[PDB]
Amino acid sequence: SAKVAFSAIRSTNHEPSEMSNRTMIIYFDQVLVNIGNNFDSERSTFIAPRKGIYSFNFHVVKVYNRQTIQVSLMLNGWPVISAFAGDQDVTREAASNGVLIQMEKGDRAYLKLERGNLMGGWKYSTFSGFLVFPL
Amino acid sequence: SAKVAFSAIRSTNHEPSETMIIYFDQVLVNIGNNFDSERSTFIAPRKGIYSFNFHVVKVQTIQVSLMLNGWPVISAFAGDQDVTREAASNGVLIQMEKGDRAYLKLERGNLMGGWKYSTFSGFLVFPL
Amino acid sequence: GSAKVAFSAIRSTRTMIIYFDQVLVNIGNNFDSERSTFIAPRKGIYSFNFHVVKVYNRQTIQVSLMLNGWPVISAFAGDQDVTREAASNGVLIQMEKGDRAYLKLERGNLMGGWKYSTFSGFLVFPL
Numbered sequence: 001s002a003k004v005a006f007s008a009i010r011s012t013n014h015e016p017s018e019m020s021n022r023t024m025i026i027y028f029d030q031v032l033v034n035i036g037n038n039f040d041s042e043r044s045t046f047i048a049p050r051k052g053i054y055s056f057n058f059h060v061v062k063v064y065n066r067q068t069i070q071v072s073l074m075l076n077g078w079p080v081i082s083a084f085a086g087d088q089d090v091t092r093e094a095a096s097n098g099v100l101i102q103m104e105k106g107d108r109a110y111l112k113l114e115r116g117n118l119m120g121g122w123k124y125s126t127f128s129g130f131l132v133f134p135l
Numbered sequence: 136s137a138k139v140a141f142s143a144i145r146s147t148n149h150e151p152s153e154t155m156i157i158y159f160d161q162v163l164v165n166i167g168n169n170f171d172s173e174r175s176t177f178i179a180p181r182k183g184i185y186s187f188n189f190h191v192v193k194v195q196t197i198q199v200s201l202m203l204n205g206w207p208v209i210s211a212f213a214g215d216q217d218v219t220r221e222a223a224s225n226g227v228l229i230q231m232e233k234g235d236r237a238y239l240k241l242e243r244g245n246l247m248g249g250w251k252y253s254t255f256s257g258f259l260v261f262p263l
Numbered sequence: 264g265s266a267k268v269a270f271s272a273i274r275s276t277r278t279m280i281i282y283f284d285q286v287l288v289n290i291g292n293n294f295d296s297e298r299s300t301f302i303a304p305r306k307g308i309y310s311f312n313f314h315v316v317k318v319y320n321r322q323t324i325q326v327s328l329m330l331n332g333w334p335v336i337s338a339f340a341g342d343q344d345v346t347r348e349a350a351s352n353g354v355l356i357q358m359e360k361g362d363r364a365y366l367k368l369e370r371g372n373l374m375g376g377w378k379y380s381t382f383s384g385f386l387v388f389p390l
Protein backbone atom coordinates (compact mmCIF):
# COMPACT_ATOMS: atom_id res chain seq x y z
CA SER A 1 0.00 0.00 0.00
CA ALA A 2 1.55 3.25 1.22
CA LYS A 3 4.91 1.82 2.36
CA VAL A 4 6.90 -0.03 -0.33
CA ALA A 5 10.70 -0.09 -0.31
CA PHE A 6 13.48 -2.50 -1.22
CA SER A 7 17.26 -2.40 -0.77
CA ALA A 8 19.61 -5.09 -2.07
CA ILE A 9 23.37 -5.56 -2.15
CA ARG A 10 25.63 -8.18 -3.73
CA SER A 11 27.79 -9.25 -0.78
CA THR A 12 29.90 -11.70 -2.76
CA ASN A 13 32.48 -11.86 -5.57
CA HIS A 14 31.12 -15.11 -7.05
CA GLU A 15 30.70 -15.43 -10.80
CA PRO A 16 27.23 -15.14 -12.37
CA SER A 17 25.13 -18.19 -13.09
CA GLU A 18 24.92 -19.39 -16.67
CA MET A 19 21.20 -18.71 -16.30
CA SER A 20 22.09 -15.14 -15.34
CA ASN A 21 24.60 -14.85 -18.19
CA ARG A 22 21.72 -15.46 -20.61
CA THR A 23 18.98 -13.21 -19.23
CA MET A 24 21.60 -10.46 -18.73
CA ILE A 25 19.76 -9.61 -15.48
CA ILE A 26 21.98 -8.45 -12.62
CA TYR A 27 20.92 -10.16 -9.40
CA PHE A 28 21.56 -9.32 -5.75
CA ASP A 29 21.72 -11.91 -2.96
CA GLN A 30 21.76 -9.84 0.26
CA VAL A 31 18.43 -8.03 0.71
CA LEU A 32 18.58 -5.39 3.44
CA VAL A 33 15.05 -3.96 2.99
CA ASN A 34 11.91 -5.44 1.47
CA ILE A 35 8.68 -3.79 2.61
CA GLY A 36 5.74 -5.42 0.90
CA ASN A 37 8.00 -8.13 -0.61
CA ASN A 38 7.43 -6.68 -4.10
CA PHE A 39 11.15 -7.17 -4.79
CA ASP A 40 11.13 -10.89 -5.49
CA SER A 41 13.40 -13.85 -4.64
CA GLU A 42 16.91 -13.22 -6.05
CA ARG A 43 15.43 -12.53 -9.47
CA SER A 44 16.07 -8.84 -8.71
CA THR A 45 12.92 -7.64 -10.48
CA PHE A 46 10.68 -5.09 -8.78
CA ILE A 47 6.92 -5.49 -9.24
CA ALA A 48 4.98 -2.26 -8.82
CA PRO A 49 2.10 -2.97 -6.41
CA ARG A 50 0.08 0.12 -7.37
CA LYS A 51 0.16 3.32 -9.41
CA GLY A 52 2.54 6.04 -8.29
CA ILE A 53 5.96 7.62 -8.53
CA TYR A 54 8.86 5.33 -7.62
CA SER A 55 12.53 6.07 -6.95
CA PHE A 56 15.35 3.85 -8.19
CA ASN A 57 19.10 3.90 -7.59
CA PHE A 58 21.87 1.45 -8.44
CA HIS A 59 25.65 1.14 -8.22
CA VAL A 60 27.35 -1.71 -10.12
CA VAL A 61 30.92 -2.10 -8.83
CA LYS A 62 33.51 -4.37 -10.44
CA VAL A 63 37.01 -5.54 -9.59
CA TYR A 64 38.05 -6.08 -13.22
CA ASN A 65 37.43 -2.98 -15.37
CA ARG A 66 39.20 -3.95 -18.62
CA GLN A 67 36.18 -4.03 -20.94
CA THR A 68 33.47 -1.37 -20.89
CA ILE A 69 30.16 -2.33 -19.29
CA GLN A 70 26.75 -0.71 -19.79
CA VAL A 71 23.95 -1.15 -17.25
CA SER A 72 20.41 -0.19 -18.26
CA LEU A 73 17.47 0.28 -15.90
CA MET A 74 14.70 -1.64 -17.67
CA LEU A 75 10.94 -1.03 -17.56
CA ASN A 76 8.90 -3.93 -19.00
CA GLY A 77 11.82 -4.87 -21.22
CA TRP A 78 12.61 -1.33 -22.39
CA PRO A 79 15.64 0.69 -21.25
CA VAL A 80 14.93 3.89 -19.31
CA ILE A 81 18.33 5.12 -18.08
CA SER A 82 21.87 3.83 -18.57
CA ALA A 83 25.20 3.87 -16.75
CA PHE A 84 28.69 3.42 -18.18
CA ALA A 85 32.03 2.19 -16.83
CA GLY A 86 35.02 0.10 -17.86
CA ASP A 87 38.11 0.50 -20.04
CA GLN A 88 40.00 1.22 -16.80
CA ASP A 89 42.74 -0.26 -14.63
CA VAL A 90 41.56 0.76 -11.15
CA THR A 91 40.83 -0.80 -7.77
CA ARG A 92 37.04 -0.69 -8.03
CA GLU A 93 34.75 1.28 -10.34
CA ALA A 94 30.98 1.79 -10.23
CA ALA A 95 28.43 2.28 -13.01
CA SER A 96 25.77 4.30 -11.21
CA ASN A 97 22.58 6.19 -12.05
CA GLY A 98 19.19 6.98 -10.56
CA VAL A 99 15.79 8.16 -11.74
CA LEU A 100 12.15 8.64 -10.75
CA ILE A 101 9.59 6.73 -12.83
CA GLN A 102 5.80 6.78 -12.91
CA MET A 103 4.68 3.17 -12.51
CA GLU A 104 1.38 1.42 -13.09
CA LYS A 105 0.16 -1.72 -11.34
CA GLY A 106 2.37 -4.67 -12.22
CA ASP A 107 5.27 -3.03 -14.05
CA ARG A 108 8.67 -4.73 -13.89
CA ALA A 109 11.85 -2.77 -13.13
CA TYR A 110 15.25 -4.45 -13.14
CA LEU A 111 18.89 -3.99 -14.12
CA LYS A 112 20.20 -5.44 -17.38
CA LEU A 113 23.88 -5.77 -18.28
CA GLU A 114 23.46 -4.42 -21.81
CA ARG A 115 27.19 -4.64 -22.59
CA GLY A 116 30.23 -6.20 -20.99
CA ASN A 117 30.46 -9.01 -18.46
CA LEU A 118 30.58 -9.56 -14.70
CA MET A 119 33.87 -11.47 -14.61
CA GLY A 120 35.65 -11.27 -11.28
CA GLY A 121 32.24 -10.80 -9.69
CA TRP A 122 30.33 -7.63 -8.92
CA LYS A 123 30.64 -7.00 -5.18
CA TYR A 124 29.39 -4.13 -3.00
CA SER A 125 26.91 -3.40 -5.81
CA THR A 126 23.62 -1.90 -4.66
CA PHE A 127 20.05 -1.56 -5.92
CA SER A 128 17.52 0.57 -4.04
CA GLY A 129 13.93 1.55 -4.70
CA PHE A 130 10.83 2.84 -2.93
CA LEU A 131 7.40 4.32 -3.57
CA VAL A 132 7.59 8.11 -3.30
CA PHE A 133 3.80 8.53 -3.34
CA PRO A 134 0.91 6.72 -5.05
CA LEU A 135 -1.13 8.51 -7.69
CA SER B 136 0.99 20.83 -2.86
CA ALA B 137 1.66 17.56 -1.05
CA LYS B 138 2.91 15.38 -3.94
CA VAL B 139 5.72 16.98 -5.98
CA ALA B 140 8.27 15.13 -8.10
CA PHE B 141 10.16 15.52 -11.36
CA SER B 142 12.54 13.45 -13.48
CA ALA B 143 14.22 14.22 -16.81
CA ILE B 144 16.83 12.80 -19.19
CA ARG B 145 18.95 13.98 -22.11
CA SER B 146 17.72 11.56 -24.78
CA THR B 147 19.96 12.71 -27.67
CA ASN B 148 23.62 13.54 -28.22
CA HIS B 149 22.73 16.96 -29.66
CA GLU B 150 24.96 19.96 -29.04
CA PRO B 151 23.81 22.60 -26.53
CA SER B 152 21.62 25.56 -27.42
CA GLU B 153 21.95 29.20 -26.42
CA THR B 154 23.36 30.83 -20.34
CA MET B 155 25.37 27.86 -19.04
CA ILE B 156 22.29 25.85 -17.98
CA ILE B 157 22.08 22.10 -18.62
CA TYR B 158 18.60 21.23 -19.93
CA PHE B 159 16.93 17.85 -20.38
CA ASP B 160 14.51 17.15 -23.23
CA GLN B 161 12.83 13.92 -22.10
CA VAL B 162 10.67 14.29 -18.97
CA LEU B 163 9.59 11.02 -17.37
CA VAL B 164 7.92 12.44 -14.23
CA ASN B 165 6.40 15.87 -13.62
CA ILE B 166 3.89 15.98 -10.76
CA GLY B 167 2.49 19.44 -10.16
CA ASN B 168 4.25 20.73 -13.31
CA ASN B 169 6.74 22.62 -11.12
CA PHE B 170 9.52 21.53 -13.49
CA ASP B 171 9.39 23.88 -16.44
CA SER B 172 9.24 23.32 -20.19
CA GLU B 173 12.16 21.19 -21.48
CA ARG B 174 14.74 23.09 -19.38
CA SER B 175 16.52 22.64 -16.04
CA THR B 176 14.55 24.87 -13.64
CA PHE B 177 12.44 23.51 -10.77
CA ILE B 178 10.39 26.00 -8.74
CA ALA B 179 9.54 25.05 -5.16
CA PRO B 180 5.76 25.36 -4.67
CA ARG B 181 5.85 25.24 -0.85
CA LYS B 182 8.18 25.28 2.14
CA GLY B 183 9.76 21.90 2.84
CA ILE B 184 12.70 19.57 2.42
CA TYR B 185 13.39 18.55 -1.18
CA SER B 186 15.60 15.81 -2.60
CA PHE B 187 17.76 16.40 -5.66
CA ASN B 188 19.93 14.08 -7.74
CA PHE B 189 21.81 14.47 -11.01
CA HIS B 190 24.19 12.44 -13.20
CA VAL B 191 25.67 14.55 -16.01
CA VAL B 192 27.34 12.21 -18.52
CA LYS B 193 29.91 13.49 -21.03
CA VAL B 194 32.20 12.00 -23.68
CA GLN B 195 37.22 17.81 -20.81
CA THR B 196 37.12 18.39 -17.05
CA ILE B 197 33.64 19.80 -16.49
CA GLN B 198 32.14 21.07 -13.23
CA VAL B 199 28.39 20.85 -12.60
CA SER B 200 27.07 22.93 -9.70
CA LEU B 201 23.53 22.51 -8.36
CA MET B 202 22.28 26.10 -8.24
CA LEU B 203 19.82 27.61 -5.76
CA ASN B 204 18.64 31.16 -6.52
CA GLY B 205 21.91 31.93 -8.29
CA TRP B 206 24.41 30.55 -5.80
CA PRO B 207 26.01 27.09 -5.98
CA VAL B 208 25.03 24.62 -3.24
CA ILE B 209 26.85 21.41 -4.23
CA SER B 210 29.38 20.69 -6.96
CA ALA B 211 30.30 17.67 -9.08
CA PHE B 212 33.48 17.08 -11.07
CA ALA B 213 34.32 14.85 -14.05
CA GLY B 214 38.01 14.84 -14.93
CA ASP B 215 38.35 13.47 -18.46
CA GLN B 216 40.83 10.61 -18.38
CA ASP B 217 41.13 8.10 -21.21
CA VAL B 218 37.45 7.06 -21.26
CA THR B 219 34.52 6.85 -23.66
CA ARG B 220 32.13 8.48 -21.17
CA GLU B 221 32.30 10.03 -17.71
CA ALA B 222 29.67 11.25 -15.25
CA ALA B 223 29.63 14.09 -12.73
CA SER B 224 27.22 13.04 -9.99
CA ASN B 225 26.00 14.36 -6.64
CA GLY B 226 22.86 14.64 -4.54
CA VAL B 227 21.63 16.50 -1.48
CA LEU B 228 18.58 17.59 0.52
CA ILE B 229 17.88 21.33 0.71
CA GLN B 230 15.44 23.37 2.77
CA MET B 231 13.56 25.53 0.27
CA GLU B 232 10.90 28.24 0.34
CA LYS B 233 7.97 28.96 -1.96
CA GLY B 234 9.52 30.39 -5.12
CA ASP B 235 13.07 29.03 -4.79
CA ARG B 236 14.61 27.85 -8.06
CA ALA B 237 16.91 24.82 -8.24
CA TYR B 238 18.75 24.00 -11.46
CA LEU B 239 22.03 22.72 -12.87
CA LYS B 240 24.78 25.03 -14.11
CA LEU B 241 27.86 23.88 -16.05
CA GLU B 242 30.45 25.93 -14.17
CA ARG B 243 33.58 24.76 -16.01
CA GLY B 244 34.13 23.17 -19.40
CA ASN B 245 31.64 22.45 -22.16
CA LEU B 246 29.36 19.63 -23.28
CA MET B 247 30.14 18.81 -26.91
CA GLY B 248 29.37 15.43 -28.33
CA GLY B 249 26.22 15.76 -26.23
CA TRP B 250 25.34 15.09 -22.62
CA LYS B 251 23.13 12.14 -23.58
CA TYR B 252 21.97 9.76 -20.80
CA SER B 253 22.36 12.57 -18.25
CA THR B 254 19.64 12.51 -15.60
CA PHE B 255 18.04 14.99 -13.22
CA SER B 256 15.61 14.04 -10.47
CA GLY B 257 13.87 15.58 -7.47
CA PHE B 258 10.84 15.28 -5.19
CA LEU B 259 9.31 16.85 -2.09
CA VAL B 260 10.28 14.74 0.92
CA PHE B 261 7.97 16.45 3.42
CA PRO B 262 6.51 19.96 3.71
CA LEU B 263 7.24 22.50 6.43
CA GLY C 264 6.40 16.27 13.33
CA SER C 265 7.71 12.89 14.48
CA ALA C 266 7.35 11.50 10.94
CA LYS C 267 9.78 14.06 9.46
CA VAL C 268 13.46 13.10 9.81
CA ALA C 269 16.04 14.32 7.30
CA PHE C 270 19.63 15.55 7.26
CA SER C 271 22.09 16.70 4.61
CA ALA C 272 25.60 18.08 4.99
CA ILE C 273 28.56 19.16 2.88
CA ARG C 274 32.26 19.47 3.66
CA SER C 275 33.71 22.93 2.98
CA THR C 276 36.95 24.70 3.87
CA ARG C 277 40.87 8.70 15.39
CA THR C 278 38.14 6.21 14.44
CA MET C 279 38.52 7.37 10.80
CA ILE C 280 35.06 8.98 10.80
CA ILE C 281 34.48 11.46 7.96
CA TYR C 282 32.85 14.76 8.90
CA PHE C 283 30.85 17.40 7.02
CA ASP C 284 31.01 20.85 8.60
CA GLN C 285 28.32 22.65 6.60
CA VAL C 286 24.86 21.28 7.48
CA LEU C 287 22.23 22.19 4.89
CA VAL C 288 19.30 20.26 6.41
CA ASN C 289 18.71 18.89 9.91
CA ILE C 290 15.08 18.14 10.77
CA GLY C 291 14.78 16.72 14.26
CA ASN C 292 18.44 17.58 14.98
CA ASN C 293 19.32 13.86 14.90
CA PHE C 294 22.57 14.44 12.97
CA ASP C 295 25.36 15.69 15.25
CA SER C 296 28.98 15.25 16.44
CA GLU C 297 30.38 17.45 13.64
CA ARG C 298 30.34 14.61 11.09
CA SER C 299 28.07 12.21 9.20
CA THR C 300 26.74 10.69 12.43
CA PHE C 301 22.99 10.17 12.79
CA ILE C 302 20.86 8.44 15.43
CA ALA C 303 17.53 7.00 14.28
CA PRO C 304 14.71 8.57 16.35
CA ARG C 305 12.23 5.76 15.63
CA LYS C 306 11.94 2.42 13.88
CA GLY C 307 11.47 2.60 10.14
CA ILE C 308 13.10 2.59 6.72
CA TYR C 309 15.76 5.26 6.20
CA SER C 310 17.48 6.42 3.03
CA PHE C 311 21.18 7.25 2.87
CA ASN C 312 23.52 8.55 0.16
CA PHE C 313 27.05 9.91 0.21
CA HIS C 314 29.67 11.24 -2.20
CA VAL C 315 33.20 11.34 -0.74
CA VAL C 316 35.46 13.35 -3.05
CA LYS C 317 38.97 11.99 -3.64
CA VAL C 318 40.76 15.32 -4.15
CA TYR C 319 44.42 14.36 -4.51
CA ASN C 320 45.21 12.42 -7.67
CA ARG C 321 47.46 9.48 -6.83
CA GLN C 322 45.61 8.13 -3.78
CA THR C 323 43.11 5.31 -3.33
CA ILE C 324 40.26 5.57 -0.82
CA GLN C 325 37.48 3.30 0.44
CA VAL C 326 34.46 4.65 2.32
CA SER C 327 32.16 2.29 4.24
CA LEU C 328 28.74 3.27 5.57
CA MET C 329 28.61 2.02 9.16
CA LEU C 330 25.66 0.75 11.21
CA ASN C 331 26.63 0.57 14.91
CA GLY C 332 30.25 -0.17 14.06
CA TRP C 333 29.71 -2.54 11.13
CA PRO C 334 30.05 -1.79 7.41
CA VAL C 335 26.83 -2.04 5.39
CA ILE C 336 27.84 -0.65 1.97
CA SER C 337 31.18 0.39 0.51
CA ALA C 338 32.27 3.06 -1.96
CA PHE C 339 35.56 3.06 -3.88
CA ALA C 340 37.59 5.75 -5.62
CA GLY C 341 41.26 5.47 -6.50
CA ASP C 342 44.01 3.73 -8.48
CA GLN C 343 43.41 6.38 -11.14
CA ASP C 344 44.82 9.75 -12.19
CA VAL C 345 41.66 11.89 -12.03
CA THR C 346 41.18 14.78 -9.61
CA ARG C 347 38.04 15.04 -7.46
CA GLU C 348 36.81 11.50 -8.08
CA ALA C 349 33.72 10.68 -6.03
CA ALA C 350 33.50 7.57 -3.85
CA SER C 351 29.71 7.30 -3.94
CA ASN C 352 27.00 4.81 -2.96
CA GLY C 353 23.54 4.68 -1.40
CA VAL C 354 21.24 2.29 0.42
CA LEU C 355 17.98 1.97 2.35
CA ILE C 356 18.24 0.53 5.87
CA GLN C 357 15.88 -0.88 8.47
CA MET C 358 16.80 0.80 11.76
CA GLU C 359 15.53 1.03 15.33
CA LYS C 360 15.75 3.81 17.90
CA GLY C 361 19.38 4.34 18.88
CA ASP C 362 20.99 3.03 15.69
CA ARG C 363 24.04 5.04 14.61
CA ALA C 364 24.78 5.53 10.91
CA TYR C 365 27.99 7.25 9.81
CA LEU C 366 30.77 7.17 7.23
CA LYS C 367 34.18 5.62 7.89
CA LEU C 368 37.35 6.11 5.84
CA GLU C 369 38.08 2.39 5.73
CA ARG C 370 41.22 2.56 3.56
CA GLY C 371 43.52 5.44 2.63
CA ASN C 372 43.75 9.03 3.81
CA LEU C 373 41.75 11.80 2.15
CA MET C 374 44.62 13.86 0.70
CA GLY C 375 44.12 17.30 -0.70
CA GLY C 376 41.32 17.16 1.85
CA TRP C 377 37.78 16.27 0.92
CA LYS C 378 35.55 19.09 -0.30
CA TYR C 379 32.11 19.16 -1.93
CA SER C 380 31.67 15.80 -0.23
CA THR C 381 27.99 15.29 0.56
CA PHE C 382 26.22 13.08 3.08
CA SER C 383 22.42 13.05 3.31
CA GLY C 384 19.69 10.79 4.65
CA PHE C 385 16.02 10.83 5.53
CA LEU C 386 13.24 8.70 6.98
CA VAL C 387 11.23 7.13 4.15
CA PHE C 388 8.45 5.80 6.39
CA PRO C 389 8.26 4.60 10.01
CA LEU C 390 7.46 1.09 11.21
Ligand SMILES: *[C@@H]1O[C@H](CO)[C@@H](O)[C@H](O)[C@H]1NC(C)=O
Nearest residue numbers: 015016017018021117118119
Ligand atom coordinates in the same frame (compact mmCIF):
# COMPACT_ATOMS: atom_id res chain seq x y z
C1 LIG D 1 29.08 -16.18 -16.73
O1 LIG D 1 29.95 -15.32 -17.48
C2 LIG D 1 31.15 -14.95 -16.77
C3 LIG D 1 31.90 -13.98 -17.66
O2 LIG D 1 32.37 -14.63 -18.84
C4 LIG D 1 31.95 -16.19 -16.40
O3 LIG D 1 33.08 -15.80 -15.62
C5 LIG D 1 31.09 -17.17 -15.61
O4 LIG D 1 31.81 -18.37 -15.37
C6 LIG D 1 29.81 -17.47 -16.38
N1 LIG D 1 28.95 -18.37 -15.62
C7 LIG D 1 29.07 -19.70 -15.66
C8 LIG D 1 28.11 -20.48 -14.81
O5 LIG D 1 29.91 -20.25 -16.36
